[PDB]
Ligand binder design. Sequence first.
Ligand code: BF4
Ligand code: BEF
Ligand code: BEF
Ligand code: BEF
Ligand SMILES: [Mg+2]
Ligand SMILES: [Mg+2]
Lengths: 122, 121
Amino acid sequence: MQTPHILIVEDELVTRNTLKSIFEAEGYDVFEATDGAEMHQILSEYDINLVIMDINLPGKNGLLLARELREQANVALMFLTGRDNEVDKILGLEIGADDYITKPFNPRELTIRARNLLSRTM
Amino acid sequence: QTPHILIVEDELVTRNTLKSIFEAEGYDVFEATDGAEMHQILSEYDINLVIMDINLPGKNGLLLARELREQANVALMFLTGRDNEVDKILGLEIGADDYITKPFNPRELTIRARNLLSRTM
Ligand code: BF4
Ligand code: BEF
Ligand code: BEF
Ligand code: BEF
Ligand SMILES: [Mg+2]
Ligand SMILES: [Mg+2]
């Protein structure tokens, strides 16, 4: 029924372009932030159903951005990050992300996890 | 309410370990080795999360998950030695909320279960 709105918080242009075309190929509207200030402004200004969080960002890192997000909102959240190590994965989940996916990733896996998560939260 | 976990797993050392992992979380743990036992526990008790192994005696867990999904939206995670991209993608497509491979980090497992239960309960 409702058109899903996805926010990708991701500092690399090429990765954003890829994520955008993957999610548009799902019928979603894609909002883009390169950092924490752009993220907060999109979140205060537009309906957002799912946040995809990179960790290595200019300014605050994705984990802390996630922590702040979780004090305001219970919006669906998934990390998508090149931080492919057990500690960051566990922290990201502990902080309250619904999922944690490493780059490089299978795009089908990303979109099916997003879809099941959205079905559960929208 | 205290969470009720149904673990469907036919290897008893694995299952005993899951049972103790989840009891250490304060959860009530129900156990099944196959689909007949799983369906009986689902009719008799209130189950908040199903942890589903794939290689089972009788019907495989992907098929049991598919049947389950036609009857119920219950929280579901695969936990399985099928560490391949095809089965992962299939399990998610069938509607599992997560898919976790053995060997597993028990902390990853309890935290993912906790977050999922926070959504569904
Ligand atoms: F529209 Be969907 F994302 F709920 F399937
Ligand atoms: F820069 Be992200 F954490 F991959
Ligand atoms: F037998 Be299970 F799929 F590890
Ligand atoms: F993911 Be659906 F709500 F079973
Ligand atoms: Mg980055
Ligand atoms: Mg088995």
